[PDB]
């Protein structure tokens with residue numbers, strides 16, 4: 256069987272991630288999604304409606320509010336006994352709890368699996384994506400995170416399986432203090448089909464708006480490089496790369512980004528990459544399917560106008 | 563308190579990994595190695611804690627091959643008080659798994675009496691992002707991952723984390739493992755006199771068996787191939803030719 260950690264946030268299930276995960280793992284047995292949180296009920300519902308989810312477990316309890324690694328990891332382990340595969344989408348929530356879980360069961364962890372060759376052979380990108388390693392876990396239980404950006408979010412029409420309820424356990428080692436949420440009113444980066452990212456070439460937070468205009472025009476999500484975030488042009492939440500989010504939309508327009516290895520790591524798998532830089536030698540122009548060498552302050556607004 | 567800082571020796575983050583044309587592994591044979599970027603951040607934070615009378619001693623530990631010592635000395639140069647080197651691999655190609663590392667750090671942490679551990683978010687080579695958590699798990703301690711700010715105060719710490727969506731601040735009991743995100747601080751550079759001084763600081767060369775730990779890989783690497791080389795790429799001449807090329 257396979258226990259899968261549902262990616263729920265403010266009582267709202269992130270269907271795209273959970274879908275892609277179920278889609279990736281369904282070929283291993285009966286997928287059973289676990290929704291734990293302070294408001295996991297509604298999520299549980301949406302979880303059940305996904306094509307492939309054999310059943311849904313719910314753990315709605317204040318103890319799981321924000322899914323603190325200590326309480327949550329205790330939950331999963333307590334249930335691990337009936338599953339040989341425990342997985343989840345490679346999200347921060349999953350990256351925080353999964354390794355802890357694995358250690359508790361005294362088993363390794365497979366991070367960012369891009370391909371499941373079978374019940375124990377997996378594929379994962381190493382060296383900031385410059386190499387793909389095929390590993391074989393000799394472990395009794397395969398604990399791992401799914402690199403959602405390499406699968407398709409299959410679902411929407413499901414068999415609406417069962418929705419039970421679970422227990423608890425609380426090692427009082429942590430508490431949530433506060434949250435600083437970033438206003439994102441456009442396609443969430445990881446799910447977007449089109450992404451327009453801004454780098455340092457933009458010069459200011461003001462000029463980043465021309466990136467946003469083009470994005471809206473294309474109904475795309477906005478991405479960013481370290482430079483842009485460090486200089487305050489945009490929130491770190493929009494960072495694409497080995498440290499941030501790794502996306503793979505149909506269209507990825509990189510304007511004002513040199514194409515550093517660390518940035519490519521999160522977008523070299525995009526279908527079509529377009530680059531507009533003023534430096535004809537920037538590394539980005541060696542991976543970009545279609546590149547244009549010019550001033551982003553003259554090209555982007557012209558591109559936006561002929562769209 | 564004594565702070566423990568795990569640092570790793572891996573490829574220079576600017577070097578493009580070359581994959582042998584026979585799935586053996588990344589050809590690390592003749593490449594420049596350096597300290598894992600996230601670890602330098604870790605060290606720098608530990609040192610900052612010392613400069614505020616929070617930490618008394620700072621132990622820097624690295625596990626791998628003999629040459630890892632160079633990385634430890636770099637740590638000592640930045641401000642680490644002493645270092646411990648756990649030799650486990652006989653060749654640079656044998657990367658030891660986060661599970662093995664965790665079990666070792668756990669023994670080292672217990673033996674040296676460290677109450678706070680500060681590891682990097684992830685090792686830019688295996689991209690595992692798991693050691694710190696596995697450590698907190700094995701030790702039975704709290705954990706603060708992807709830290710951006712660590713306000714350690716009393717028998718607990720207020721650490722704001724870099725999470726999806728924004729920032730999330732939590733409070734953990736003091737005996738905790740913390741992992742650093744690239745935004746925690748700007749690491750200092752070891753100056754010539756301090757590098758020379760660092761050469762006279764302690765560095766205990768130990769072995770995996772000293773901690774009674776089996777560095778056997780739970781994951782057998784069957785092969786490693788080069789990623790798919792994308793198809794050419796055209797460099798257009800005008801916005802029109804761009805929008806007019808589909």
Ligand SMILES: Cc1cc2nc3c(=O)[nH]c(=O)nc-3n(C[C@H](O)[C@H](O)[C@H](O)COP(=O)(O)OP(=O)(O)OC[C@H]3O[C@@H](n4cnc5c(N)ncnc54)[C@H](O)[C@@H]3O)c2cc1C
Pocket residue numbers: 453454455456457479480481482483494495496497498499510511512513514515516517518521531532533534537549550551552575599600686744
């Ligand atoms: C361990 C580690 C992890 C990292 N993780 C990430 C990560 O996840 N994501 C990430 O993005 N970075 C990451 N970085 C940083 C990364 O290494 C690069 O330094 C960063 O991506 C560079 O950002 P940039 O391309 O915006 O700036 P630069 O490299 O300075 O490129 C700026 C570009 O702007 C072009 N330009 C300027 N003005 C114009 C103009 N008017 N018109 C057109 N083009 C113009 C310039 O030619 C240049 O190509 C990480 C670094 C480390 C050490």
Ligand SMILES: Nc1ncnc2c1ncn2[C@@H]1O[C@H](COP(=O)(O)O)[C@@H](O)[C@H]1O
Pocket residue numbers: 568569570571598600601604623624625626658660663680681682683684685686688689690691692693694
């Ligand atoms: N071989 C090692 N020696 C020392 N510290 C290590 C080693 N492997 C991992 N670590 C620590 O654990 C962090 C995360 O690595 P990883 O879990 O592989 O992403 C590293 O940044 C170091 O702080």
